[PDB]
Design a protein around this nucleic acid. Structure first.
Ligand code: AGS
Ligand code: AGS
Ligand code: AGS
Ligand code: MG
Ligand code: MG
Ligand code: MG
Lengths: 442, 440, 441, 59, 58
DNA sequence: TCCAGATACACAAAAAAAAAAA
């Protein structure tokens, strides 16, 4: 059988070395003298490496002269073969890939050789017992695997990591940026715990029906759009853009939502609406997608298109993740939810922007004495919680207990945070404006 | 090419088993039906096992009767061959040597087969790179010698228990013992119960999200590094290394973690950080790995390299075992979990170093009225429960009930222990310092 | 198509009959005259049966004489064939297996014959209807079952049961044992009201926490181990073997538990401990297991292994049944406890040894005016009280009433006995030594 | 083979038809029997039958 | 079908961000015994040569 | 592999009773 090898890869490596000299540093750290297969190729590579290490400039003429000095010019095919190799070079940009291919082929060939060597033993014990045969397998495989080393995926001593951490904390002494390092939510208490909405993270807001989930997410997105510079993308798979716009106008302009919807407004309400209209038309930092049944690929494509068009994004909202469709798994729901969650996390990591994805809760919450949500109430949510960087629930006590002393107030439960504290935050809820607010009072 | 085999040993063992049956128990633990080379011998051994396990007496007549019940006498060679096996056997006093030699020959043949498999697997990679092939080769070679683990988990007689009790009483009589033998955990009650993290054991720390698994593991690792001489190896598969160093500085200097993260510090905090850094650079006995999705083979290789370079290890931490990937079992999860647990146990036995493998619990735990974990709530609980030596759980009631009067207190539950008592321990939890301390 | 038979099996049967005559009673109840297949084999078997029934010794000479009498020497292959019949027999220890193989061959041959007869009759109704054919088939297939004469399980007539019961009663009557017919418990009153721990029974000892439950169980185990011969098996799901061993040493050597735990002893205590250790090492008839959360199959397998190693058991103890786990029924506790109790009862029946399983009590006992426990107080325990054979509760009046004039005395109330009277006994308690004793005065 | 998915599909189809035709749609529904076990007999949103989507999709 | 396979190879190479050229695609197709179906290296070379520019690739 | 409907045993226990404390 033909051993695995790529002569074209070796020719490309030689051509790239001849044509380009500034990239020798990267090539020198990936290939050796014994990695090449063809003997004339080995001689040519040895000569080129010797010339390059000698410090002399590399060119076809000097390479031919050096080969003639050792009388190996005719052995490697002559000057014509070298000229053909130089002419057949595709480009010098991808010499690293060629070197990696050559190294991989050498590794697999040596592994096959070691396998044949161990296989030969056993057909001729030569006095060795089973224990000796077992022992002289691990040593050979470890020898053939030790040549490759992870870079830099290796254990590190405390000195380097401690020095890097000291450097990090020394530069962070200046410019505190008032605590928040990501996207300002607008609520001081939640800013203290979450330290803003960090990028490359997945944030999940979940609650029972009619709790204030879409309102909370829209408030966060509106504050981000008002403060930040890059646009904020919203995927409204539940409601049309008209209703979201009416809610935003009611929230910003301090105008009753019902009067806006029914068209019963006085002069002051119109003045407030005109002011917020002027502000919104001056900003131009909001995008709404009202399409239904979007697949993860479509969401990714549209997000990438917007990001490339405007150079970046600030925040992405999905409402909600259970309404997305994966046609390849229409016969299974749990796997579909897992794929949706993994795709959302991958998109968040790729675009380096936070993604606020909403979710629903199971009906087991209301069949218990205590109605406070937990992490198990999310529907089909092994993956929903496994790959979530922050889970925030919404709980209003006045819904279940009409006589509760916490009327006109809501609690945000941080059920999970990888690098932050957890707890509860109390916020004032004003439904007629579709707005949350800081708790000025007790 | 003649593969390694020996018909004489098979004939002798078959004749001996036919001749005498009181020796079946001694031989049944050394050979298996698939070890025999030729097919008729495998059929004969299968029939012998079926007859003997049923309790019926085994002779030539009943064996020939059994083989006829499935139309198999012709394939073996008829009653004549069995009669020849019964007659030509001189004796059966040295049957165990034949069992050992046939097992050795079968092992050699299996190793030859695995070598041929790896050799042929490299000519048609089918989209696989060199690292995957090397990992598969290492796994195949290692799985051959790993199967020699059995004959355990049985009730003890009176003599062993009495000797252990007398040794314990004598050790209690002796004062210079300090109550611990292995790695001191730094906590009072935990040392009283577990007697330290004993060597060559697998420890499983399991808790719900946001409970204090990483904090507890890091505290144990810091205590081991401060006390022991040989270094401590940490496999961080989820967190960056800088965050781990920040947590360690906060825990050792009693400085708020948020202050370090944000950069608002005073003079006392800087002095404490300087002293802690001085101590840490004086010790220099910790190693942190931040790779993601490590295979068991890579973990084993890195651990062995570190041990050879430094001459020994004291503690190994994995965070966590649910992230490790087995390339050959990407289509099954329970088998992958079993393989990971077995590999960790084998590494712990080989290096004589305890391994702290964190785990996560199923979501059905939160549906019950009582939120405290049990041994049956583990994710893929079977293999992990079977292969573990010390299972600990972390429970904080303030996470579920904010109004609970147990603020600033965590409960450690010892769900399993082979050589010790089970129970519960309460510890003081200080979140801002990411530290577990003793409870008054 | 060759009919199902094996000439080697019948040849071995007749050879074993000729060689040995001391096991004829062990083989005459299986094979019959017509159950053989080969005609010469049937003839020689009939001759052997005729010789044996006459009481005459059986050997080659007698067989040859009988064959000459019936002039069947040529019909049986000659005297050389007769010698070969008794020559190719390895051993006579497995004659019953050969006999049952021959019987099975005869049965399957008869079944094939009946099936062929039914098939032949089907194609030739001879003026019969489908119902008649079905009835004929039912009768033919039922005749084979009726003529079985040997079937495992199933209903049995009253004569055999009566004979076995009378034999058991006579055997018990011929052996004087002073009213004890089981395993000695160590207490006179308990033995009088229980006749020891009978086999194939599930015994439950239950009490409130910190009442002397484990102490009573270990006292029974120590007494049984000292008295009996076959080993005792203990499953400790709460304490390791070390604590149990320390308690046993303290009880048998009359040494304070606190002194043993703290390591402070004296010369007399050391001498007593050495003597107890020597006696226990001389006996060596106990086993302790500490694995937690044992499934019923695991304990069954371990008990089977120990019994096979030592050729029997004397007592199996579990402490306690409420810690065992059944993975398949984790969604309901009541069904899990029912399965645990059923498995314990099945193990007791199979190994023919008494099983003792400990259990707890509900907190509802405290609410009621009377603190004396009853059957219903056991925890999730429908099958616990519906499957046990003897239930005993440990009651200490001093715990609830410090002014009671019965300090240091624990009363055992027999809450249930399926085949005996119910009642209560009084025993003294020794906390400083952790040992129950008989009450006097 | 699955009643919950069938009810979810029915509710989704009704909502889609209402959105398409631009017309109010009244979908009468039943209630579960868990209401009868409570001292307060006033219905709640969670008492609808096989009704994840019924209460998560209605306006 | 050969175009389908070569497009699958191109998608696999470019989705990870690694550079794509004749050598990389040829070595990727050869690793799975699929270079013979598409016509060998000659067809890939002809395809690379026959394209003047990508001005209207969209 | 989750969601939803329904029969039955058990845990107390929960309050209420309520006795009785006042
Ligand atoms: N004018 C108003 N006055 C008082 N409350 C109002 C008014 N308008 C809306 N609300 C309430 O505001 C809340 C808005 O709920 P949302 O958060 O928008 O919906 P949701 O939480 O996403 O739940 P879904 O999507 O319907 S399952 C509801 O509880 C309404 O009853
Ligand atoms: N920076 C911090 N400031 C304050 N409290 C913190 C901080 N980080 C963690 N905590 C708290 O300390 C607890 C310790 O949990 P950790 O062990 O750090 O995380 P965890 O148990 O690994 O959660 P996972 O990784 O999602 S399973 C957290 O649950 C928080 O309550
Ligand atoms: N030194 C001692 N002096 C006096 N009483 C003691 C001493 N040591 C133990 N005891 C008591 O002896 C009794 C025997 O304990 P146990 O029989 O184990 O009660 P138990 O709680 O039912 O055990 P379980 O069911 O296995 S948890 C307990 O009530 C102890 O309080
Ligand atoms: Mg909504
Ligand atoms: Mg963690
Ligand atoms: Mg006990």
């Amino acid at each position: 059988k033909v051993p695995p090898h790529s002569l074209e890869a070796e020719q490309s490596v030689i051509g790239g070395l001849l044509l380009d000299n500034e990239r020798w540093d990267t090539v020198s750290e990936h290939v050796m003298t014994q990695d090449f297969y063809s003997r004339p190729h080995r001689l040519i590579f040895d000569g080129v490496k010797s010339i390059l290490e000698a410090g002399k400039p590399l060119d076809l003429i000097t390479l031919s002269e050096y080969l003639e000095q050792r009388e190996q010019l005719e052995d490697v095919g002559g000057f014509a073969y070298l000229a053909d190799l130089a002419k057949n070079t595709p480009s010098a940009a991808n010499i690293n890939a060629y070197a990696e291919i050559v190294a991989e082929r050498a590794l697999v060939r040596n592994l096959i050789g070691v396998a044949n060597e161990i296989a030969d033993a056993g057909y001729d014990p030569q006095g060795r017992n089973a224990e000796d045969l077992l022992d002289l397998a691990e040593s050979k495989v470890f020898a053939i695997a030790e040549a490759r080393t992870s870079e830099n995926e290796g254990p590190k001593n405390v000195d380097s990591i401690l020095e890097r951490t000291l450097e990090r904390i020394e530069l962070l002494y200046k410019t505190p940026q008032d605590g928040v390092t990501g996207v300002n939510t607008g609520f001081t208490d939640l800013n203290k715990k979450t330290a803003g909405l960090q990028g490359s993270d997945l944030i999940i807001v979940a609650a029972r029906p009619s709790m204030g989930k879409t309102t909370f997410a829209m408030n966060l997105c509106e504050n981000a759009a008002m403060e930040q510079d890059k646009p904020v993308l919203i995927f409204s798979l539940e409601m049309p853009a008209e209703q979201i716009m009416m809610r935003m106008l009611a929230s910003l302009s301090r105008v009753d939502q019902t009067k806006i919807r029914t068209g019963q407004l006085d002069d002051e309400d119109w003045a407030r609406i005109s002011s917020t209209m002027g502000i919104l038309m001056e900003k131009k930092n909001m995008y709404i997608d009202d399409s239904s049944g979007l697949t993860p690929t479509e969401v990714r494509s549209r997000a990438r298109r917007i990001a490339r068009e405007h150079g970046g994004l600030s925040l992405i909202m999905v409402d909600y993740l259970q309404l997305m469709r994966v046609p390849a798994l229409t016969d299974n729901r749990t796997l579909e939810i897992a794929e949706i969650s993994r795709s959302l996390k991958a998109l968040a990591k790729e675009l380096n922007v936070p993604v606020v994805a909403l979710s629903q809760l199971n009906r087991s919450l209301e069949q218990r004495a205590d109605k406070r949500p937990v992490n198990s109430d999310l529907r089909e949510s092994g993956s929903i919680e496994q790959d979530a960087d922050l889970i925030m629930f919404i709980y209003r006590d006045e819904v279940y207990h009409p006589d509760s002393p916490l009327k006109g107030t809501a609690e945000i439960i941080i059920g999970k945070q990888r690098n932050g504290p957890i707890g509860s935050v109390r916020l004032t809820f004003q439904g007629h404006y579709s707005r949350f607010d800081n708790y000025a009072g007790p």
